[PDB]
Amino acid sequence: MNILLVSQCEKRALSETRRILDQFAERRGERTWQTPITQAGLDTLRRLLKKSAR
DNA sequence: AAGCTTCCGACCCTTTTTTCGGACGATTTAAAAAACCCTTATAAATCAGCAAGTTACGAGACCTCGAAAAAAGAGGGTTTCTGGCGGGAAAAACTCAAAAAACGCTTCGAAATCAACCGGTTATAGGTTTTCGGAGCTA
Secondary structure, eight states: OEEEEEOOOOHHHHHHHHHHHTTTSOBOSSSEEEEEOOHHHHHHHHHHHHHTOO
16 A cells, blocks of 8 residues: 655645654655555554644 | 766756845034024013903713624534344243043032121231342452
């Protein structure tokens, strides 16, 4: 399972999103990450982002 | 000798850093302009309290615009409370059947009886007091 993530967030939300994703993948651009990851991990990732969405 | 691969020089273009120049501001110094002083007897201002007439400054009010704060509206999400539907087990009606059990025939003669009133029997409605079961609690 191989993932590519992009963020269109802005203002206060962008900082929070960076706070989460940076702990799961190396950053490849200003707003994008790319990494391999297991299915369970990805589920945890989405759950975490949802928990504090704006 | 030829082809492939790799450096190297020449150049082209744009961005990033440095240097220089120019301009503007600030400060200092010098020059120019406004001003101060010294001579005045005579003319005008000083001021006394109050009247009579007027207003420059203060207060009130409203408007105007702009911005700030608050409230509302929107959207993202999670947790839970309820309702509907589906599924398995138990109950009870429904269907099928037998075997008793009652009823009738049908009893002339043997109990059953009601009545009022006494004493006596005792099931139990109702209330009173109490073990058993469960509360979970805690590692």
